[PDB]
């Protein structure tokens, strides 16, 4: 599929910049025929047919595609895509209020405070994989505030640069994501589904409540290779004082075996609920 080739900077001014990843420089930017911002992404597009800097075109369209489908108050959207030599030009919503991993580090949450930010990421994925799309890059990085400044903020989930669409139930394609937050079966290279975002969420939740990763080692092989083992605790130092119903909504999330893992939707009716990746 082939974007919109004018100069995108003839209709938007770019401002600072946002933030970055592996594929993307994200720049705050202002559309000139109606004042409204964005985040512009633009991704850096592979210059040989066998290079392994920038991004492939197959990558860029299925981001690409699967933003174009998204439309809910908990996902961020697409509003425009520009393309040049060199770039793939993503106008997304902008979220300014900053990722919920800065959030995270300004402040442990009390539960309430967790089962507010969760409610709404639950709310995102479920719609997600209504629509058959895996994330696969579930973290706090990936969870961005609308206004960190109000008592209850309104997030999004945003960078759909591993999302995939599962038409099988499972895909085989080895996505790999960060190593704290990947399932065991991206570690052990097998086939993944709508399930490994729910052992992302299980992680998520643990660190929302105690300000601890539970997998996380010293170098990322390790990280991985304690995800493998399922090997995790409940600290007391920082849960003693957490309601069982939280432990048992992790625990419930945080199995080796997808098929024996939460759904999104169980997620929901749960009880406490219910009202790369070498160095
Ligand atoms: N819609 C947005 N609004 C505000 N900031 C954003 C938005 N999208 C991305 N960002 C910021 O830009 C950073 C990089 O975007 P992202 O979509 O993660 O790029 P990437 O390089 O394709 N993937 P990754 O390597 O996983 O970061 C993010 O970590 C956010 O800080």
Known sequence: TVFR???????YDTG??????????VKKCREKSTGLQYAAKFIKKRRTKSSRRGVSR???????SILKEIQHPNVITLHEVYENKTDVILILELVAGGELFD?????????????????????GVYYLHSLQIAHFDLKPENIMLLDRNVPKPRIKIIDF?????????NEFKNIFGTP?????????????????????????????????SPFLGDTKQETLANVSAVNYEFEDEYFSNTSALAKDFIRRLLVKDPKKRMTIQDSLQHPWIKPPQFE
């Open 180 to 212: 704290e937050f990947v399932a065991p079966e991206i570690v052990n290279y097998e086939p993944l589904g709508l399930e490994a975002d729910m052992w992302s969420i299980g992680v998520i939740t643990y660190i929302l409540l105690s300000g601890a």
């Open 161 to 169: 640069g591993l999302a995939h669409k599962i038409d099988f139930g």
């Open 5 to 11: 080739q004018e100069n995108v900077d003839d209709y």
């Open 103 to 123: 959030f995270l580090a300004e402040k442990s949450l009390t539960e309430e405070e967790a089962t507010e930010f969760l409610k709404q990421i639950l709310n």
């Open 58 to 64: 197959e990558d860029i369209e299925r981001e690409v």
């Open 16 to 25: 600072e910049e946002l933030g970055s990843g592996q594929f993307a420089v």
